[PDB]
Amino acid sequence: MSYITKQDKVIAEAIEREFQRQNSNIELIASENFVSEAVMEAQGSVLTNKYAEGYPGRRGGCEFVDVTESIAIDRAKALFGAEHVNVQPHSGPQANMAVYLVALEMGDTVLGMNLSHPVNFSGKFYNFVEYGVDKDTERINYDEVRKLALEHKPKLIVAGASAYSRTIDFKKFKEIADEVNAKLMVDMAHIAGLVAAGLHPNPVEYADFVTTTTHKTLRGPRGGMILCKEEYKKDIDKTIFPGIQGGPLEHVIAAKAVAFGEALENNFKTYQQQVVKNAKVLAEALINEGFRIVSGGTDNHLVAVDVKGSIGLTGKEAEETLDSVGITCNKNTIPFDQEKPFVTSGIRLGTPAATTRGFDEKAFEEVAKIISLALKNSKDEEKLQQAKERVAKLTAEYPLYQ
Amino acid sequence: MSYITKQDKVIAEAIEREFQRQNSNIELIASENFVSEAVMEAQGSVLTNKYAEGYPGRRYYGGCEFVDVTESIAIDRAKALFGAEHVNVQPHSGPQANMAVYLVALEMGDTVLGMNLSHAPVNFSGKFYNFVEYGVDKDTERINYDEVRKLALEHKPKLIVAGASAYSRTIDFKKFKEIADEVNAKLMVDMAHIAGLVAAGLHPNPVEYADFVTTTTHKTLRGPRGGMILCKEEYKKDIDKTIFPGIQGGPLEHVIAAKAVAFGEALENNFKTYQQQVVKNAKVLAEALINEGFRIVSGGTDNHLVAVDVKGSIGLTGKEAEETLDSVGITCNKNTIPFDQEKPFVTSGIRLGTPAATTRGFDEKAFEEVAKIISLALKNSKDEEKLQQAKERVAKLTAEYPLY
Numbered sequence: 001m002s003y004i005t006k007q008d009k010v011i012a013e014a015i016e017r018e019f020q021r022q023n024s025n026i027e028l029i030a031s032e033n034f035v036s037e038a039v040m041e042a043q044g045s046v047l048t049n050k051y052a053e054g055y056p057g058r059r060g061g062c063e064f065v066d067v068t069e070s071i072a073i074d075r076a077k078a079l080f081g082a083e084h085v086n087v088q089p090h091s092g093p094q095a096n097m098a099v100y101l102v103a104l105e106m107g108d109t110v111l112g113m114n115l116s117h118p119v120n121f122s123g124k125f126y127n128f129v130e131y132g133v134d135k136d137t138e139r140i141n142y143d144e145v146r147k148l149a150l151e152h153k154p155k156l157i158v159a160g161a162s163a164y165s166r167t168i169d170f171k172k173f174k175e176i177a178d179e180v181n182a183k184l185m186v187d188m189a190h191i192a193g194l195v196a197a198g199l200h201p202n203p204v205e206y207a208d209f210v211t212t213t214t215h216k217t218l219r220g221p222r223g224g225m226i227l228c229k230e231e232y233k234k235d236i237d238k239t240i241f242p243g244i245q246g247g248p249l250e251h252v253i254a255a256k257a258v259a260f261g262e263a264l265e266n267n268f269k270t271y272q273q274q275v276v277k278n279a280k281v282l283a284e285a286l287i288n289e290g291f292r293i294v295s296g297g298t299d300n301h302l303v304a305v306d307v308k309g310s311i312g313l314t315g316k317e318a319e320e321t322l323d324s325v326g327i328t329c330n331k332n333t334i335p336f337d338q339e340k341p342f343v344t345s346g347i348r349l350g351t352p353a354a355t356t357r358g359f360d361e362k363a364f365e366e367v368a369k370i371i372s373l374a375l376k377n378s379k380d381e382e383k384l385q386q387a388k389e390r391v392a393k394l395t396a397e398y399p400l401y402q
Numbered sequence: 403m404s405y406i407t408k409q410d411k412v413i414a415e416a417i418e419r420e421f422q423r424q425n426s427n428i429e430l431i432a433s434e435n436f437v438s439e440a441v442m443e444a445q446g447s448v449l450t451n452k453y454a455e456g457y458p459g460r461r462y463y464g465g466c467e468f469v470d471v472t473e474s475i476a477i478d479r480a481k482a483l484f485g486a487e488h489v490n491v492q493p494h495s496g497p498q499a500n501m502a503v504y505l506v507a508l509e510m511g512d513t514v515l516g517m518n519l520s521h522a523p524v525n526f527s528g529k530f531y532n533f534v535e536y537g538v539d540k541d542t543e544r545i546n547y548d549e550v551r552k553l554a555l556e557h558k559p560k561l562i563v564a565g566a567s568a569y570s571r572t573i574d575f576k577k578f579k580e581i582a583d584e585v586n587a588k589l590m591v592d593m594a595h596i597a598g599l600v601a602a603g604l605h606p607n608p609v610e611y612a613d614f615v616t617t618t619t620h621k622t623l624r625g626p627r628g629g630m631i632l633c634k635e636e637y638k639k640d641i642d643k644t645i646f647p648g649i650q651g652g653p654l655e656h657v658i659a660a661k662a663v664a665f666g667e668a669l670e671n672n673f674k675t676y677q678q679q680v681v682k683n684a685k686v687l688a689e690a691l692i693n694e695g696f697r698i699v700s701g702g703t704d705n706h707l708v709a710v711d712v713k714g715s716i717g718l719t720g721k722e723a724e725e726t727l728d729s730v731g732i733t734c735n736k737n738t739i740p741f742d743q744e745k746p747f748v749t750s751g752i753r754l755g756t757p758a759a760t761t762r763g764f765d766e767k768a769f770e771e772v773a774k775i776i777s778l779a780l781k782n783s784k785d786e787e788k789l790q791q792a793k794e795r796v797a798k799l800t801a802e803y804p805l806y
Contacts, residue, residue, distance in 0.1 A: 001443055004663065006440075015447050015448070017468045030453075036405065038410060042417070043446050045421075046424060046806075047420055048626055049437060061728070063423070064416050064419045067412075067416040097649065119644075221450055222656075242524050243525065244526050245497055246497050247495075254416070258409070
């Protein structure tokens with residue numbers, strides 16, 4: 001931060017405070033994560049200066065960004081086994097838009113788990129039908145998904161996308177999609193790191209198209225990626241450029257390469273096994289104390305707690321109470337939530353980031369204890385001060401970026 | 403680079419080679435540039451880890467105290483530079499900025515009237531709207547505003563766009579606004595090429611007249627790669643919701659902090675001095691090339707861009723020219739001149755821009771030498787000794803003006 005402190009003290013101080021915020025709070029923000037120094041060094045490189053419209057081999061001065069882009073693609077194939085990879089999407093939404101633009105005509109029907117946040121492009125230019133989860137199980141009901149598919153005849157079925165805490169069976173989506181002659185897209189943003197580590201089934205075996213963010217469980221820089229069958233390659237590539245993007249962010253793409261190389265290491269699997277163990281420990285500990293967990297558990301890194309049903313606090317109340325003791329999570333609409341969307345019945349907890357900084361089972365059992373202390377005693381200052389001190393013990397035990 | 407070198411040698415190596423390629427070559431690629439080490443440090447920061455859906459003070463996930471500071475500073479500095487009523491710094495790229503504007507100003511199928519020089523359509527703007535092009539006059543190779551007006555009256559665009567193309571002359575936004583008002587169209591300016599010049603006061607500011615102004619934050623503005631929308635207050639709600647949740651999700655806050663840094667740099671007095679040199683350098687390059695017998699599209703330049711009619715001057719195609727110059731260490735793009743009779747991937751022209759070389763310190767004397775090198779190589783494209791001479795003269799300039 002040498003040059004930036006000299007040039008722009010006010011931005012440099014804000015950046016340092018953001019580092020200290022990430023360090024002094026236990027963030028349990030869904031699928032979010034901490035990237036490596038290597039990843040940040042790539043994003044911060046001179047590749048930001050490069051103008052590289054087009055694709056490797058067919059862009060010019062692009063000889064070296066051809067190397068970093070092609071290695072991003074190679075590593076992506078090694079991780080996920082996809083026939084064709086595009087590492088140019090600027091974000092998940094850009095990856096998603098390109099797929100929709102290829103798979104659909106405007107006005108066509110799409111069947112997906114929930115409509116993101118209609119303002120969203122997917123709801124505006126297409127007839128988006130949601131399947132959600134069953135009111136009794138709080139999980140996907142494949143019978144229900146199939147009935148909707150037969151009734152609405154979507155041209156595209158989407159699985160994933162939502163921050164869902166249970167396994168998604170892509171074989172059963174493929175069966176349903178084939179029955180109604182729909183293409184299948186999976187947005188694996190939340191679970192891509194689990195997929196990479198073999199701990200969630202891989203949608204590439206079944207999907208026409210797979211989109212993802214490169215950040216989150218995959219622990220890369222913020223950005224997107226599309227994997228698809230070879231038959232869609234030409235349309236997908238031209239849709240990304242010049243369809244909806246221009247030049248790619250080659251510094252970010254190099255950083256994608258770095259992250260993908262990390263994900264191919266044996267210790268990434270160990271990492272993701274710890275992420276999932278930690279989430280199970282957290283859920284179980286909360287359950288042991290009377291907290292109802294949506295769907296009664298988790299199969300992944302996410303834990304959704306019904307705080308309203310368990311202790312009578314709203315999700316908004318739970319969120320603020322936790323933030324005040326140093327735990328950052330988000331209020332969450334539970335399935336068929338009676339509370340308004342601004343208030344909600346739930347909070348959503350995710351283990352990737354705290355696991356990256358070193359948290360293990362004992363640490364997550366203590367996090368469960370802290371959460372329970374704070375939420376069950378939300379008006380008791382001594383209790384809250386205790387919780388805050390216990391959060392402080394954990395952060396000091398596991399400092400960020402050492 | 404120590405962490406990447408330790409962990410991922412292949413990538414570290416490629417990045418080091420890229421740095422060396424930037425240093426060893428004289429890059430004259432239209433509006434491209436070299437950002438500061440401060441800008442890179444911001445992009446390379448831990449702000450990449452932060453999920454910050456929404457806008458400052460109105461976020462969907464909490465813990466946004468500090469990214470609210472950086473995003474708010476980027477907005478405030480953008481207003482100080484361009485005088486815009488509303489600014490959105492979240493667009494991931496120029497094309498995301500542009501798409502958001504079109505989604506707000508237009509319904510699918512509506513007519514839009516916009517410049518094109520490069521000439522179903524693959525671009526979103528051409529595929530989902532009825533995009534009518536204006537270009538330049540065949541004889542002047544400049545915008546003919548009576549023709550623009552004629553097209554507007556004939557086609558009744560709901561949106562008229564000015565800028566966007568890599569045009570070498572000043573664009574009169576007053577005349578565009580008069581035409582837009584006549585046909586009851588909104589006016590958008592894509593100032594990506596000229597944003598730095600506008601910030602420096604060297605090109606008139608389209609914010610005075612436009613409903614919407616889009617830009618990249620890189621190029622002449624010399625910032626990180628990304629987008630920005632400036633717009634009248636009356637469109638602020640629709641614009642912000644079209645960017646999020648319309649077509650994007652979380653912003654890239656590390657990049658936005660890097661925007662703030664670039665905008666800070668652009669506010670300094672030395673930025674105007676830099677832009678003055680950019681434009682002087684391009685005049686020198688154009689005039690030196692004319693003295694060497696090259697025809698310049700429109701006869702010269704008002705900005706950082708110099709478009710050369712290589713086919714009409716010496717009988718090489720833009721493709722041959724681009725290749726010959728790359729072999730001697732000069733990077734430029736072939737381009738379609740107006741009413742170009744060569745095929746689209748062959749072309750008659752090359753386009754040169756001065757921002758990047760100016761950033762590394764080139765002055766008038768340096769750019770006169772660039773013209774002579776270009777003339778030597780292009781006029782002797784099959785003469786190994788003269789090409790090696792060109793190559794050596796490039797190496798003298800790159801040694802004189804090392805990067806970073």
